[PDB]
Every structure is written in structure tokens, then in C-alpha cells.
């Protein structure tokens, strides 16, 4: 049961578009989260009595940059956490969270990057989704572009969100074209591509690294929402997605009995397993999050109200909703983040405020 223990506001007064706890923080280290907004990323540490201790920021050299998204990983050789950030410039920056140095950056996307996600099993595999209608899969060990998910049969407008399934065998993406698309990355072609990305060392060869051009999703639907689809999450073999229509829909491709790995690209059907309604979230780019174990789901709305669903029930439609309000929290909440142990929930807002809720 959450209580609001603290809040603060960042000095830039611009929206905080993203927040992420570091789920790779070491045993006995305090809980750390990153916020992104304006042209900066800031790290904070959670301490007792609701204390949110300010650490250090990375500020982009370009005053016109606007960071939208961040995602945590770790260096696969040293174990040290890394933070990937991206936004309107379409440049991915890999940040050393200790010093806030930009270690390296990746350019490619035709435009703004709307989301970053790391593979659940491989800390080096970074997925970016873009205003340019495409997804890109990067290997941040060998600094290679593994594949581009695009084409006529891919998204036809900005991609706003994507999520890897549990094992990182497939991705579901969504965007402004109202569609949700499945891209399997466990095909013979994609698995070989990933392996080749690891064998690539530009200093030991003459060849450039060749990226896969993936031009056909393994499933596609526009039958779930009737506006911009701005957030998607796997829930096992089921999907959770939302638009700006005041609902999270729980659904699956095919008919009720259809196995996700038996779904063919021509699949015409979807099955709706439930829908979580809420209020006043008519603006787009408003993201829900889940805890580490996927026992709960949190979403903020456009007037600063938090919705939390308990998913620890037998069927999706039986989820139990709880609400969290504070009389001074009135700005739009863009994203939430649970600490890994689920003891803390952070919400960040359009007025640069940060809200801490302790369980």
C-alpha cells in the first residue's frame, strides 16, 4: 500500500518524459533512478524518510536536444551499469552513470527516437524505435547495427513503443498508424545476424558490418485501438497495450486457443481478454510500467492521478485497481518506475516534478 513520501521539481521546468530505476544496481547499493527531460538526464538516489538525493546530470552540448527515453543495462565484461538515452536528435548516447561521461553514441535513425529497450537475456542488444517509422537493433559491445525493422509492410507512421517478450525471441511494436506489429528475432536469419554482430571487429577485417533489412512483420493488427498506440508490454504470451483512449487492452493474436508461436503473418484475428479503463489520459506519449516480476502495472494520467493494477489474479480481466492521488500533484504524469524490489514507485511529470511513493 503506497504512500507519497516526497516530491521535487527540476530547474528546467520542461516535461520529464521518462523515468527508470536501475534494476542492475549492486547488492547493498542504494536504489537509483534516472529521469530524462529537456536536454538532460539526471540520476537520483533513494534514501530513508523519503529523501531523493540528487547526484549528477549529463547535459547535451546541443541546447535543442530533447531526451525522451532512457534504459539501463550493464557492461557485459565489467558488470558496471550503463545508461542509454535518446530523444529528438535521434542519437543514442551510452552514459557512464558513475561519472556521467558519454562513452559513445550511435547515429542512424531518420529522426527522433521515441523508445529504447534492452534485450532481457543479452545486455548488449539495444532496440530503438523511431519517428522515422522503423525499429533498429544495435549490438553495443561491437558497436554494430544488427537489423532495421521497416519497409512498406512495417509501420507507416512514427513508432512510439516496443517490447521484447520474456526470452527476447520476439518484439511487439506499436505507433501512430494505430497498429501493433510482431517481429520474431529468433528466426535462423536473425540468430545468425546476432552471432555475426559478435564476430565483427572493424580492425580485423575490410568489410563493413551488414545490417538485416526486415521488411515484413510476423503479425500485424489495427483492431485493438482506434488512435495512436503509445505503449506496449508483453504479459507472458499476451499483450498489454494502450492508446490515448483511456484504456489498457489485454489481447492476443489469433483465436483464444491459438499458440503465439503458431501464428502466421496472415493472421486476421485477435482475442480480447480484458480492458482496464481509467480517466483523463487523452494526450499521447503516456506510458505505463510494470514491476520486475510483472505482479503490478502502474499508469499516470494527464492531471496527476496514479492507477495501479494488481495482476496477481487468475485471468487478466480480474485485475484489481488501486488509485494514488496527492493534492499538489496536478501535472500530467508521463511515466512511472518501480524499484526492482517493488518498495518504491516514482512518477515524473510535465512540470518537471518527481513524485515518490513508498509501499
Amino acid at each position: 500500500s503506497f504512500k507519497c513520501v516526497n516530491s521535487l521539481k527540476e530547474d528546467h521546468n520542461q516535461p520529464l518524459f521518462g523515468v527508470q530505476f536501475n534494476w542492475h544496481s549492486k547488492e547493498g547499493d542504494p536504489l537509483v533512478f534516472a529521469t530524462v527531460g529537456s536536454n538532460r538526464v539526471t540520476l537520483y538516489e533513494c534514501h530513508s524518510q523519503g529523501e531523493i538525493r540528487l547526484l549528477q546530470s549529463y547535459v547535451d552540448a546541443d541546447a535543442d536536444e530533447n531526451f525522451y527515453t532512457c534504459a539501463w543495462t550493464y557492461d557485459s565484461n565489467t558488470s558496471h551499469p550503463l545508461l542509454a538515452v535518446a530523444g529528438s536528435r535521434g542519437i543514442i548516447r551510452i552514459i557512464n552513470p558513475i561519472t556521467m561521461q558519454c562513452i559513445k553514441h550511435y547515429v542512424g535513425h531518420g529522426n527522433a527516437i521515441n523508445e529504447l529497450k534492452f534485450h532481457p537475456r543479452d545486455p548488449n542488444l539495444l532496440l530503438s524505435v523511431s519517428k522515422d517509422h522503423a525499429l533498429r537493433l544495435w549490438n553495443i559491445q561491437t558497436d554494430t547495427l544488427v537489423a532495421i525493422f521497416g519497409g512498406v509492410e512495417g509501420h507507416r507512421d512514427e513508432v512510439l513503443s516496443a517490447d521484447y517478450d520474456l526470452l527476447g525471441e520476439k518484439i511487439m511494436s506499436c505507433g501512430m498508424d494505430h497498429s501493433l506489429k510482431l517481429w520474431r528475432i529468433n528466426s535462423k536469419r536473425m540468430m545468425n545476424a546476432i552471432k555475426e554482430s559478435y564476430d565483427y571487429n572493424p580492425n580485423k577485417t575490410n568489410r563493413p558490418f551488414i545490417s538485416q533489412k526486415i521488411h515484413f512483420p510476423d503479425f500485424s493488427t489495427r483492431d485493438i485501438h482506434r488512435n495512436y498506440v503509445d505503449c506496449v508490454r508483453w504479459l507472458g504470451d499476451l499483450i498489454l497495450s494502450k492508446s490515448c483512449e483511456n484504456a489498457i487492452v489485454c489481447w492476443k493474436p489469433g483465436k483464444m486457443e491459438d499458440d503465439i508461436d503458431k501464428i502466421k503473418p496472415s493472421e486476421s484475428n485477435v482475442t480480447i481478454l480484458g480492458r482496464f479503463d481509467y480517466s483523463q489520459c487523452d494526450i499521447w506519449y503516456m506510458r505505463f510500467s510494470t514491476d520486475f516480476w510483472q505482479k503490478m502495472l502502474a499508469l499516470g494520467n494527464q492531471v496527476g492521478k496514479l492507477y495501479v493494477w494488481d495482476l496477481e489474479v487468475e485471468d487478466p480481466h480480474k485485475a484489481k485497481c488501486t488509485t494514488l492521488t496527492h493534492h499538489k500533484c496536478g501535472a500530467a504524469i508521463r511515466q512511472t518506475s518501480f524499484s526492482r524490489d517493488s518498495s518504491i514507485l516514482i512518477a515524473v511529470c510535465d512540470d518537471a516534478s518527481i513524485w515518490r511513493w513508498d509501499r
Binding site: C244, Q302, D350
Partner: peptide, 7 residues
């Protein structure tokens, strides 16, 4: 139709 930020 669909705003990113509140008017």
C-alpha cells in the same frame, strides 16, 4: 486531433 501536451 491528438495532442502530445495539454493545451
Amino acid at each position: 486531433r491528438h495532442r502530445k501536451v495539454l493545451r
